[PDB]
Design an enzyme around this catalytic site. Sequence first.
Site, short mmCIF file in Angstrom:
data_model
loop_
_atom_site.label_atom_id
_atom_site.label_comp_id
_atom_site.label_asym_id
_atom_site.label_seq_id
_atom_site.Cartn_x
_atom_site.Cartn_y
_atom_site.Cartn_z
CG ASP A 7 38.47 45.77 56.21
OD1 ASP A 7 37.16 45.23 56.22
OD2 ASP A 7 39.39 45.75 55.75
CG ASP A 49 34.20 41.86 53.47
OD1 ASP A 49 34.75 42.33 54.58
OD2 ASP A 49 34.97 42.11 52.31
CE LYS A 64 38.21 36.07 50.83
NZ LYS A 64 37.29 37.24 51.27
NE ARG A 67 39.72 33.91 54.25
CZ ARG A 67 39.52 35.17 54.26
NH1 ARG A 67 38.41 36.01 54.11
NH2 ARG A 67 40.81 35.90 54.07
CD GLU A 109 37.37 39.66 48.57
OE1 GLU A 109 38.15 40.40 49.42
OE2 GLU A 109 37.67 38.99 47.84
CG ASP A 112 36.92 44.14 45.06
OD1 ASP A 112 38.06 44.29 44.23
OD2 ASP A 112 36.69 43.24 45.60
CG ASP A 134 43.58 42.62 55.19
OD1 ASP A 134 42.72 42.32 54.16
OD2 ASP A 134 44.48 41.93 55.03
CG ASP A 136 46.00 41.42 51.82
OD1 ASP A 136 45.12 40.63 51.95
OD2 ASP A 136 47.32 41.10 51.94
CG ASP A 182 46.76 35.91 50.49
OD1 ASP A 182 46.08 36.75 50.06
OD2 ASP A 182 46.90 35.39 51.55
CG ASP A 185 42.37 36.06 50.73
OD1 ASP A 185 42.58 37.21 50.00
OD2 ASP A 185 41.61 36.02 51.66
ZN LIG Z 1 39.06 42.27 53.13
#
Ligand SMILES: [Zn+2]
Length: 271
Positions: A7, A49, A64, A67, A109, A112, A134, A136, A182, A185
Amino acid sequence: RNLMIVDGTNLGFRFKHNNSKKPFASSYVSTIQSLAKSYSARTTIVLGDKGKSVFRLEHLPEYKGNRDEKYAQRTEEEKALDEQFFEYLKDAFELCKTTFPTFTIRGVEADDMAAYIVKLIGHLYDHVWLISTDGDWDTLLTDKVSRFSFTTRREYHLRDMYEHHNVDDVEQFISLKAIMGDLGDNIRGVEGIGAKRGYNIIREFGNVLDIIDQLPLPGKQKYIQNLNASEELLFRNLILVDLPTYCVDAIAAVGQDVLDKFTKDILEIAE
Ligand SMILES: [Zn+2]
């Protein structure tokens, strides 16, 4: 030999937290060479990303959107530090280009892509290692796919789904996100329902699509009441969090051509 999917942006942010002044491009790749060595990574794929998720923004326009607000209220020095990081990151991703196959699909992302690669070639290896802090990414966990967080220096396996996520499997972790929410995000959750409460509901009624069938649910609790009116929110969140099911759509949202080239490149590496 195993597969290693990193990542990129996430690891980069870890190098930032350790120090916001010092460049990290060199250690970045080296650190990735160490991890590949340890995890007998025959194949190593670096993913970062690039931009907002086109797929998510469609189902949630304010996805998002938090952010952005945070960057709006940053002083000069803050925005400065931020810009530095992203620069050092761009350099870090350039350095990787000389050692590991790296990828950036603007509008898609990282999770993804990693999910699409896992599906696409995961079967060609003995194991798959996700390098991310992360949790997730834990929605990809299987008995052949595991994650490794530097921050904790710990690796996470499927059997660890409860201790670390309050759920029992990948499907419950998806349902919890869709029900709970969440903040990070900026995804609205059922007002009043958190990790512990969300789990219990799931344990007794099942996954989201199963809880929708049973609405209204018995109970005089306000969160149980709020739940009965979140159907619309549930259907929506489920798409935003169900990574392994919507990853092919998420990438195809930026082109049936971009999806084709990325598919070609992967297999052209896992061979
Ligand atoms: Zn991420």
